Paper text:
Shieldin is an important downstream effector of 53BP1-RIF1 to regulate the repair of DNA DSBs. REV7, also known as MAD2B and MAD2L2, is a conserved protein of the HORMA domain (named after the Hop1, REV7 and Mad2 proteins) family and undergoes an open (O)-to-closed (C) transition when partner proteins bind to the safety-belt. SHLD2 contains an N-terminal REV7 interacting motif (RIM) and a C-terminal OB fold domain that resembles RPA70, which is connected by a predicated disordered linker. In this study, we successfully solved the crystal structure of the SHLD3-REV7-SHLD2 complex, which reveals a striking SHLD3 mediated conformational dimer of C-REV7-O-REV7 and established the molecular architecture of the shieldin complex.
Author numbering:
A (entry chain C): 2 to 60
B (entry chain A): 13 to 105, 115 to 209
C (entry chain D): 5 to 16, 33 to 52
D (entry chain B): 9 to 156, 183 to 211
């Protein structure tokens, strides 16, 4: 069993209650599968985006 | 046009914020503003500001009708070549709800400078609107305001070399599905 | 092998007080 | 100072950036407190709430000697919800080779690029992260190292190897209301 060293501030009203509450943070929890990024609509090459004729002032 | 009204206000913020982050335009023009409860720098320049509002106004009819597939804010250099693309894939399937969902995107736009390679001096930007259907309907529909016309973009305009992907954020709401990623040219 | 838990984060001399405890079976308890 | 302290010191600088960045991104704390600062010539979002900054600094002030002694397996940044249930954890694992052949000059130069490569892992990891329940907070775990023919003086290496820590994010299946 592994040693824990809870660090807390003097401001805390309740030093005694920190262990049952921090008991929650140390607990491992059921992890969601690793979602990976994938573009919904990939670079197409046959579909052309609509570009406005006008151009920016670029002051 | 329940949803589409929100997207234009949102897109306008991103387009302005995007310029500030990539230093497309000198910083003198931009003015700090609180949009979406974030501090973002919008522009306070008239020639550019109308260009922006005019571009998105032309997109709403396609968003009201969900003719829009994605909207890409492209940064162009002196040679008018693509350097970075801010892709915004959009799929459309309580009012202050979504206004909180989108806020993630602003945050991730504002932190992209650390991760994107620095761009070349005197860059200029543009918008690409990829329609859902390649049909003519959208090409005549998109030109609401006259004196500001749209065209088709050639490969020269859209093709980028040695593109890299920097994902920014993905959300999957019941009312709006959206993705934001940046394609960056390896050599600039 | 020990884990140091640091507590005290903003709400929703010596800098730190310390409590030494042990972890056994999904519960936290104080030292002997 | 010595190499060990300059390495340890740098590590924390990265960590200070990472915690601020993870707070900004995850919307743990309202964004207004954040102002952009440049660390190692990198635009890092940093905080302007002195109560929150002090908590982080003191924490790192206590981690730095544990690193100077290679006694850190990993440092975790648990985001907790209203009932102090972990919502997700950003695990930064430190791989510290016993040899430690590399000199500082190589390490000093690759510092900015390394910080940039760090931001990517954190910034590209949370893209796919869902939104956290409202009204959250965080803690920080640190786990001391479990276990341990040159006398000394291993050949010089100029690589950037094992001078970065890789974080694997864990997302709870059901984050909460």
């Amino acid at each position: 069993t592994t040693e824990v060293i809870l660090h807390y501030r003097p401001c805390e009203s309740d030093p005694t209650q920190l262990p049952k509450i921090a008991e929650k943070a140390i607990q491992d929890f059921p992890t969601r599968p690793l979602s990976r990024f994938i573009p919904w609509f990939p670079y197409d090459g046959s579909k052309l985006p609509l570009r406005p004729k006008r151009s920016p002032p670029v002051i | 046009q329940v949803v589409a009204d929100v997207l234009c206000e949102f897109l306008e913020v991103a387009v302005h914020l995007i310029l500030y982050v990539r230093e497309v335009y000198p910083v003198g023009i931009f003015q700090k503003r609180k949009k979406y409860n974030v501090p973002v720098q919008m522009s306070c320049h008239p020639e550019l500001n109308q260009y922006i509002q005019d571009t998105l106004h032309c997109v709403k009819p396609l968003l009201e009708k969900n003719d829009v597939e994605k909207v890409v804010v492209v940064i162009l250099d002196k040679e008018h070549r693509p350097v970075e693309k801010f892709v915004f894939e959009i799929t459309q399937p309580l009012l202050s709800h979504v206004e909180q969902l989108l806020r993630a995107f602003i945050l991730k736009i504002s932190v992209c400078d650390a991760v994107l390679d620095h761009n070349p001096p005197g860059c200029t930007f543009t918008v690409l609107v990829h329609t859902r259907e390649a049909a003519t309907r959208n090409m005549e529909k998109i030109q609401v305001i006259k004196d500001f016309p749209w065209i088709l973009a050639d490969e020269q305009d859209v093709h980028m070399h040695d593109p890299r992907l920097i994902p920014l954020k993905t959300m999957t709401s019941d009312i709006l599905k959206m993705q934001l990623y940046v394609e960056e040219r390896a050599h600039k | 092998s020990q884990v140091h838990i640091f507590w005290g984060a903003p709400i929703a001399a010596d800098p730190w007080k310390k409590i030494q405890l042990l972890y056994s079976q999904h519960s936290l308890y104080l030292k002997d």
